[PDB]
Amino acid sequence: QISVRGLAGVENVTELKKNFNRHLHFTLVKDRNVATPRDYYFALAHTVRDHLVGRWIRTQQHYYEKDPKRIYYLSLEFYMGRTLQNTMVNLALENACDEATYQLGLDMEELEEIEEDAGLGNGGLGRLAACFLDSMATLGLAAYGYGIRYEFGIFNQKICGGWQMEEADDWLRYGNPWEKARPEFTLPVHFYGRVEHTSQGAKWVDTQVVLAMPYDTPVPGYRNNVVNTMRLWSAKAPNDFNLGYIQAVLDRNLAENISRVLYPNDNFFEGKELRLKQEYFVVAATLQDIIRRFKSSTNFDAFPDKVAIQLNDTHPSLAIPELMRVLVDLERLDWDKAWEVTVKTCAYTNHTVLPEALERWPVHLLETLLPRHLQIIYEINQRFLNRVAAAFPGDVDRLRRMSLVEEGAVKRINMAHLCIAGSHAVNGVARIHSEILKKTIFKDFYELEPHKFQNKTNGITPRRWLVLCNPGLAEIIAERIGEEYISDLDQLRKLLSYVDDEAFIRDVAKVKQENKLKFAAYLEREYKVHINPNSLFDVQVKRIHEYKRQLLNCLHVITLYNRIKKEPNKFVVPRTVMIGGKAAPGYHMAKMIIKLITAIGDVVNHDPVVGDRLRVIFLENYRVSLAEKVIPAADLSEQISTAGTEASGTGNMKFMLNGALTIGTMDGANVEMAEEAGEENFFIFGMRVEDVDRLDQRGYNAQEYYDRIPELRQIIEQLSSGFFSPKQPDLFKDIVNMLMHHDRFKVFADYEEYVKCQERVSALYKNPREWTRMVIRNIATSGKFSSDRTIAQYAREIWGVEPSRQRLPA
Amino acid sequence: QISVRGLAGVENVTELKKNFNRHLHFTLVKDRNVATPRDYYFALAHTVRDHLVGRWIRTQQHYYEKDPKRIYYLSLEFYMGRTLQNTMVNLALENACDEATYQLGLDMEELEEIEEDAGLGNGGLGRLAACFLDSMATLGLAAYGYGIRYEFGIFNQKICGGWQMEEADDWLRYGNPWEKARPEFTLPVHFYGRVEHTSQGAKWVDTQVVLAMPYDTPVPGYRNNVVNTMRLWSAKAPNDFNLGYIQAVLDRNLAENISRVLYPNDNFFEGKELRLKQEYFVVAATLQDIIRRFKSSTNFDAFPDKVAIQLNDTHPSLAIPELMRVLVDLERLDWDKAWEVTVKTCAYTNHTVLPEALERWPVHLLETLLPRHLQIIYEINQRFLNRVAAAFPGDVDRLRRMSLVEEGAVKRINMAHLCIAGSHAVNGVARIHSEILKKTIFKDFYELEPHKFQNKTNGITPRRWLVLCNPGLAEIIAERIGEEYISDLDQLRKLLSYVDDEAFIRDVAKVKQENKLKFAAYLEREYKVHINPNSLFDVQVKRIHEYKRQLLNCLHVITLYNRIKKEPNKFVVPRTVMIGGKAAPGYHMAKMIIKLITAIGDVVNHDPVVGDRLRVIFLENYRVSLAEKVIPAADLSEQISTAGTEASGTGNMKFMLNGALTIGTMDGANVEMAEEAGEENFFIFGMRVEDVDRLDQRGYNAQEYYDRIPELRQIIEQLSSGFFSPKQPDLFKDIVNMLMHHDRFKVFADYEEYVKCQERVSALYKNPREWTRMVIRNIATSGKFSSDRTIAQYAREIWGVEPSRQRLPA
């Protein structure tokens, strides 16, 4: 059908069809007379999977032959989404499979909708890991993603009575055709026990053992025949576990619960024992695998030359003391040498500055669960503080501030401090974020070791976030500059010479209209909801959190509604405001914000006077597969976090690459995006980081804004009086109280400027031609935000390896 | 290699080899350079499996077309063992696969040893179900085996310090290539709740739901292209289960524990709630499946014409009230009609007369777990007793004896009484057992409804128990009478005309010697133990139980040892006494018997004076795969249960078919075996059932035997003094006390006759030619014990269907 989707050769289509029928028969044990759509999806999945195996086996054989330096990306989250279409795209099989299935009388897009999302992540941090795996494979790096195979990923969100309801994400129910269990590589992981000091070294004994069974999933590079591996560990009890008889067998569940479910928190630390077990479980199994592979290449001096371990935040921070434990206790290396190796091997990436998100584990927990690691952590701290003391003699407060051990009610271990001390590189995920790390929270560390601190601005993969989700746009682009940009996104800059091209302007606008029509239809299909495709699609999709300020968006929506009610027969640009995202199960305020959003919709969507001029929809169960549908259909991207709180953001990059304009604060990557496209082509508003600081020094008083802004006052009074909750007048009392007395994110402070900026947005939308020309300027300058650029920087500046665009023999 | 193993055609061998390489590559994702023996086993398993699918799909399509009466065999146990070789045998692919793998440079027998046994059973009852499935498929019946897919089957037995240790049987660890999950057919099962009586009928509400997910395994008939299905249910929690958040997800384990593990009891009832849940779980899911299939053919009058439900003991007895519940509560049929249908549909098979084995569930348990079923059971009882009262007016004691409800400390429901009342046929499993049922425990029922009672003597499948485990014997037999006997075992009678054939006599003896050599080698390989292949192999393998009297065997062994020590330089026929079997985890006496056996071995096997004249070995982890090895190697089969306790026995039939002579009591099927072969060709000894009764009426006093038999006295004194337990002198005090004061099985009463009989055995073994001639007379008359004969009788006399030997188009 479309160029970018590859060729549909005669031989290939015929081959695909026969293999499809083979799998339906032999693999699924069914015939066309009883086969259901799900059966057809699996037949197709197994067919595409077969094309991966050959490349997968030789890629791994290749690494064994050349023995390049290996990159190990440790993360407790890998937000992969669906794998079928992505695999076809990277193997250039999309049109062939489309044709083959067509000839079999099946609609491939229908079959793709059957695949369950691999939701092994919460949001940005987990999705970044997924984009990174794609880019590392596309850049020919010998990389391995290591994580946990959660039986249940992020919960499926249901909206009942306007409230969020959570239900288990049993994503493995029908099986996962992409993974390959590798029980032969099962490894033991130890917990509890005690430390015994002998004549020669310490020994960790009387431990409880849990087995780690790996499952491998292929990660195909973009048309370069490279297929890397993502290895996820599953917890299994040993067979002699607890070995009345029946109960002992039933109790195996206790050990296997480690890999049972993903903790559903976004930017929030919950110090639960099960979470700590998950963190050590992944680290312990992974390091044994790493060392095993390293020995199968005694000389640990070359370990850092053959191994790089990237810690995705502090979740896998125990890799530092675990590596020391293995080198010192098991390999018998002296401390100083072991430490040198550890530092040169490990690198740490920080993803947030919010205090409530930082991991600070109670000493009593580590003491009982990992006694040897606690001892190693104390030793690390001692030697580290000795270095601080020597560099800043007499500065006693610096010593207590930099200690890995925090004193107080309960002693805690600051995992971020542990990571900085034991890593040769520490990076933020956006220029402004990395600067904040050096100026504030990690200032002391930066002063001691300035060379360790770096920046690696986030990015997204243009394969899934352009070619896959927006083929129409990828096509009109390829028509004018070729297909090379898909693996070299900077080439989109060539589109700047088409900003005045009447043909291109029309094609860009047409693609957007088609995407909106398709999405508008989807809303009625799976969610029975009517919307006007001619309206401006104003969307904010991301996890629900106070810092992301979905509440500020709500205030604007209510303002628009009140203005219409005030002057009904006055013209206003029609808008469809879409807000979606999940709230952590125990985050009360976040759940109240979801209820408020639906409550507003209940009033706005049924007001005869408003008509089809304003609609407020809450997008249920926002996840990767849904993102692929709504983002290509958006006109306006809401990135309005309080300046200094969103480390980077990545959803923002997705919207920019897909033809939406952005309204946002100078926060995270928004700053670099505006810088790339030109501030005149971005809708920036609100306080800058410096403005927020000035306000805090003076003291934030919400009452002041309430007293001086009539429209704001009205909204607050409507909320308090029960205007949006007739049956429950004080339903939103908590929201109002927070807004008025303890709003850590200064919602009111940016209200006026936000509303004003939104008016400028509506003004430009009234001029289709100019709106589209600005869109072209955004798409054309989004090249810097490809994760291929991000990974190339990690490779050269942190891992010490060169990326390659060379294909491997098929 | 050998005829009976099929042809090794050029086309087939080439095809097998290429498909083997295909699976190794695409399915296992490996190459010959990293593949392990396990990888090769799976490649072969998937290759053979492919040959089953075509036949499987068309067999099921066939039944849908012809719509024959369906047979549903409900059992909580299916002791299947390994599936690879059995599948090759039934598909006539053994030599081809043997050749194909040979050419690939692999030893197929080595790969077969890698497969895990499907140990979803305890012993005889579970193995019978497996043999039955094989025979029903071989006889072309539209049969379905329905059970539970236990995550853990019968525990693996380890012997430590002479004691039995149990370890989890994680048989699914590496995956099961034979099963096919069918999540699309998942069904809900209800528990707890309460009964609500409305205007029209009762309703079962406020129940907890557990999902039943089916897994199908193919059951190939012998070379007739028929492939039936064994459907095993797995427990799954609904996704809204218990839906803080984390705990709710972790608690899903509570529901899924239903299919977690097999209760390890043999002939013993344990009234645990989890077991009751398993019983209802299998019954509820199965009946919905049955009714669904029936409707997909309103007219329930024809239900009995299209459906037959066979209850393997009382474990699935809830099928009776569950069927009534569905017909009355859901389909709205009147009671009388529903009952008529139920009785005509259900048939019950009893497998034991031991009181401790009968299921008697506490009313308070059913009351809480299945409130509606308890009400239905009371109603059934009421109507049944009204019938008894009308047939035997004034006989008030008969009423209390026949009631389904037993009064006393705690009210209980007698499941056997429920089964007889609700079944149109009730059968024992051996002539003597079926007679005992009518004369004793079910006497009252027999008097009320004599027509219901039948006998169906057990049998074993000659495919697994001859062709598969003893190819050498199957071959020399086929050489003289052809291959037809494999599916018509009665033809073995033709071997009687070779009893004087010097060539045959030599071949039979040679096959046995080869089997003994092979097994003798195996003992050293996997268990490092030396044995004399020239000695008589005296074996008793079966679950450890007091009624099976492994203790009587022990007494004989000690007698042999004492006699040797008394006259060292006296000649005695050399023997290797092998005893094996598992003991239920909570059966103390059984565990003590295992310890005694190893203790005896510790003394006997290391006594210089004994030399290689006597060896006592305990066969560890006795299971189906081990049975296939030791039975073909046996010379003497020990079937010495107290007369009237072993309902039938099936191991006895296995030994007879494989060339071993039998020493046993006139119990269970032993009676019919001796009758078939001629008592002169059997070593029968001990009390008959009538003798046991006479002794009980008079009162069994063990002391009498102890006082009048010097050799017995010596053994008891050795046991008590610590002769077999130096460090722990009173270690076997419990055994001696039981033997002397409360032996329910009269071990001493059969001691003298047993020892005498054993002397006659040794005498015949000294004459190789005559021993072999007697063996030939046993093999030649073992035809009646084929499960094909058993199933044909069930088919014609109970299910009302005709067996077929016609092949289906391949």
Ligand SMILES: CCOC(=O)C(=O)N[C@@H]1O[C@H](CO)[C@@H](O)[C@H](O)[C@H]1O
């Ligand atoms: C560990 C605490 O961090 C998170 O939960 C988290 O998801 N942080 C997120 O990581 C993304 C990828 O770097 C950033 O773009 C987002 O701004 C940040 O909030």
Ligand SMILES: CCOC(=O)C(=O)N[C@@H]1O[C@H](CO)[C@@H](O)[C@H](O)[C@H]1O
């Ligand atoms: C339910 C209680 O019965 C058993 O546990 C059991 O395994 N019984 C066994 O069933 C076999 C097959 O009919 C018979 O041959 C054995 O004699 C009987 O003990």
Ligand SMILES: *Cc1c(COP(=O)(O)O)cnc(C)c1O
């Ligand atoms: C890209 C993505 C995110 C991150 O979005 P931000 O707006 O940067 O927080 C979260 N969830 C999903 C499903 C995503 O695809």
Ligand SMILES: *Cc1c(COP(=O)(O)O)cnc(C)c1O
């Ligand atoms: C045949 C068999 C049984 C039944 O043996 P009996 O001696 O009749 O109790 C038990 N276990 C296994 C593994 C068997 O193969």
